């Protein structure tokens, strides 16, 4: 049995399709969602989920969360460096990547890739399913944000592999939510706008849905905008307010900062139905108390630029799809941050008063869709006929003379897809040709994201411009790039091997990580 797993920034959820419906599976504490948290106690045990989250404020330095905000990123990514200020665990550079360093008891230290932390969360979700089903789970569909880049997708797949899962399919969050919405609808072709604002990432997708055929027409998002940022804006407001009023800087006392996080999260949720919320921390800093009242007005003001920025991807999607606001037949709100009244108001006002679709739990819609997809890919016959056409989120291009982004595969192209191009040499007997591939929509590569540098190696001695090497760029159904090369010269064909600077986790490295995880 293939399971569907929503691997979320703040929570994870696992479901299965059985006897013609989705079951969202409860964990050992009876909760249908599990916090995406891992902790290491001084006594040496590894805690996952609710038990890990519950000791955050007493053991903050060795409690890990928000790994999805770091996964597949490089060390000098501004979103990594900005998030470090709010995370209690040490983040250290290794392999040009942010690794997580913790104490595991007995004066001992261990360093983990974000992939490894997410693999521990996936392992717990797998075990939750295995307890319910009474048998081993080896295959899964796993969710990612629609706007995840190549590295973020591959790193999520690698987390699955470390957790002992054959990840059959990576599914984009809004597409999963669309399946939850539109499964078994036999209505005419409808244009559906999915507005997906979770704990860490924001996606907008426009889909056509017509009797089981789902097509993503356009997508745009922000992989570092979500509920965690709304908490962190309020946290920073109070850290600064405390220093102004007392002269004391609490930003290094991890217990203080994470007690503030706990209280802000509680207040934020309260402010979705109340207009005021009391923040109370007994023993905030140096044994002294902290009491403040947060109004809905103040919460909104502190975050208004972030809230208003969610309209930017909405307009980008309408422009790419060539649709007007009035062509949108349904608005599907998904992600727990869509519970914020101001977000609902901004979306409603953008679409001139149109109400969102009812009957959809924004916290569970993504997991529901992943479970359906898992059932379909298994070969189940009690699901509806599901046909999915999804897209690549980012234009792929190659750097050419003058730092120019020369487009190869445009954004919003249905995957899988491929493009080929012939390369040659600039100098006599040149043995290697380098190709830099970028992701993004700006005309200069310095303003886009480097996907990787690829070296065509083993080019046999020849005069300049004579070699003819056909390089193929294929984006698979998961949204991940593979680059291959073939010699198209006349006479003796030579093997052209490609090397890259992506620093993929190798099977050797994954095996080591599997063995390291079993020690807990």
Ligand X SMILES: Nc1ncnc2c1ncn2[C@@H]1O[C@H](COP(=O)(O)OP(=O)(O)O)[C@@H](O)[C@H]1O
Of 156, 149, 173, 202, give the one whose Cα is nearest residue 373.
173
C-beta of 13 vs 151, nearer to ligand X = 13
Nearest residue to ligand X, by Cβ distance, number only: 227
Contact 130, 136 (CB under 8 A): yes
C-beta of 6 vs 487, nearer to ligand X = 6
**Smallest gap from residue 159 Cβ to ligand X (A):** 15
C-beta of 359 vs 402, nearer to ligand X = 359
DSSP secondary structure of 222-287 = ETT-SHHHHHHHHHHHHHHHHHHHHS---TT-HHHHHHHHHHHHHHHHHTTT-SEEEEEEEEEETT
**Smallest gap from residue 73 Cβ to ligand X (A):** 17
**Smallest gap from residue 362 Cβ to ligand X (A):** 6
**Smallest gap from residue 196 Cβ to ligand X (A):** 8
Say how far apart CA 121 and CA 255 lie, in whole Å. 24
Say how far apart CA 109 and CA 13 lie, in whole Å. 30
240 part of the active site: no
Say how far apart CA 84 and CA 90 lie, in whole Å. 8
173 part of the active site: yes
455 part of the active site: no
Contact 114, 100 (CB under 8 A): yes
User: Looking at 66, 116, 173, 228, which residue is catalytic?
Assistant: 173
C-beta of 203 vs 487, nearer to ligand X = 203
Distance of CA 23 to the CA centre of its chain: 24
6 part of the active site: yes
C-beta of 265 vs 441, nearer to ligand X = 265
C-beta of 65 vs 473, nearer to ligand X = 65
Tokens 């805690």 map to which residue?
Answer: 47
Any idea what DSSP says for residue 440? S
**Smallest gap from residue 176 Cβ to ligand X (A):** 11
Of 298, 65, 337, 101, give the one whose Cα is nearest residue 196.
337
**Smallest gap from residue 381 Cβ to ligand X (A):** 30
C-beta of 265 vs 292, nearer to ligand X = 265
User: Looking at 196, 229, 330, 399, which residue is catalytic?
Assistant: 196
Say how far apart CA 499 and CA 125 lie, in whole Å. 35
Of 434, 445, 454, 433, give the one whose Cα is nearest residue 406.
445
Which chain residues interact with ligand X by CB under 6 A?
6, 8-11, 198-199, 227-228, 265, 268-269, 272, 335-337, 339-340, 363
Residue 7's H or E segment, with its range, is strand 3-7
Tokens 């380098």 map to which residue?
Answer: 434
**Smallest gap from residue 351 Cβ to ligand X (A):** 21
Neighbours of 345 (CB within 10 A): 12
Say how far apart CA 319 and CA 313 lie, in whole Å. 10
Residue 197's H or E segment, with its range, is strand 190-197
Say how far apart CA 93 and CA 99 lie, in whole Å. 6
Residue 34 has φ and ψ, to the nearest 5°, of -125, 125
**Smallest gap from residue 340 Cβ to ligand X (A):** 5
Token pair of 391 as six digits: 């897209």
Any idea what DSSP says for residue 56? T
C-beta of 124 vs 411, nearer to ligand X = 124
Mind telling me the catalytic residues? 6, 68, 173, 196
């Amino acid at each position: 049995t293939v399971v569907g797993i929503d691997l979320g920034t703040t929570y994870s959820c696992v479901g299965v399709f059985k006897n013609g419906r989705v079951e969202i599976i409860a964990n050992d504490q009876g909760n249908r969602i599990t916090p995406s948290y891992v902790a290491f106690t001084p006594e040496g045990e590894r805690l996952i989920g609710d038990a890990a989250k519950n000791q955050l404020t007493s053991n903050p330095e060795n409690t890990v969360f928000d790994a999805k905000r770091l996964i597949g990123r490089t060390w000098n990514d501004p979103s990594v460096q900005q998030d470090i200020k709010f995370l209690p665990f040490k983040v250290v550079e290794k392999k040009t990547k942010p690794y997580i360093q913790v104490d595991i008891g007995g004066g001992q230290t261990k360093t983990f890739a974000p992939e490894e932390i997410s693999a521990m969360v996936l392992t717990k979700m797998k075990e939750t399913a295995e307890a319910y089903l009474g048998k081993k789970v080896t295959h899964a569909v796993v969710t990612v944000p629609a706007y995840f880049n190549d590295a973020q997708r591959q790193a999520t797949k690698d987390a699955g592999t470390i957790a002992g899962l054959n990840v059959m399919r990576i599914i984009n969050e809004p597409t999963a939510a669309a399946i939850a919405y539109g499964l078994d609808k036999r209505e005419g072709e409808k244009n559906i706008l999915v507005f997906d604002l979770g704990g860490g990432a924001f996606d907008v997708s426009l889909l056509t849905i017509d009797n089981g055929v789902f097509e993503v027409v356009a997508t745009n998002g922000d992989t570092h905008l979500g509920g965690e940022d709304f908490d962190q804006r309020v946290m920073e407001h109070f850290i600064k307010l405390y220093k102004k009023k007392t002269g004391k800087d609490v930003r290094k006392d991890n217990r203080a900062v994470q007690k503030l996080r706990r209280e802000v999260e509680k207040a934020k949720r309260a402010l979705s139905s109340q207009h005021q919320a009391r923040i109370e921390i007994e023993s905030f800093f140096e044994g002294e108390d902290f009491s403040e009242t947060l109004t809905r007005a103040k919460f909104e003001e502190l975050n208004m630029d972030l809230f208003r920025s969610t309209m930017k991807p909405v307009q980008k999607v309408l422009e790419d799809s060539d649709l007007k606001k009035s062509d949108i037949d349904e608005i599907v709100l998904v992600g727990g941050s869509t519970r914020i009244p101001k977000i609902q108001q901004l979306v409603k006002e953008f679409f001139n008063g149109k109400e969102p679709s009812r009957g959809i739990n924004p916290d569970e819609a993504v997991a529901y869709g992943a479970a359906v997809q898992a059932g379909v890919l298994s070969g189940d016959q009690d699901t509806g006929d599901l046909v999915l056409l999804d897209v690549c989120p980012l234009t792929l291009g190659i750097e050419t003379v003058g730092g120019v982004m020369t487009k190869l595969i445009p954004r919003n192209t249905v995957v899988p897809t491929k493009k080929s191009q012939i390369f040659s040499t600039a100098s006599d007997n040149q043995p290697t040709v380098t190709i830099k591939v970028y992701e993004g929509e700006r005309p200069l590569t310095k303003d886009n994201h480097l996907l990787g540098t690829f070296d065509l190696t083993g080019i046999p001695p020849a005069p300049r411009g004579v070699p003819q090497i056909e390089v193929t760029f294929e984006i698979d159904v998961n949204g991940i790039l593979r680059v291959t090369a073939e010699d198209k010269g006349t006479g003796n064909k030579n093997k052209i091997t490609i090397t890259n600077d992506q620093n993929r986790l190798t099977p050797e490295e994954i095996e080591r990580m599997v063995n390291d995880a079993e020690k807990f």
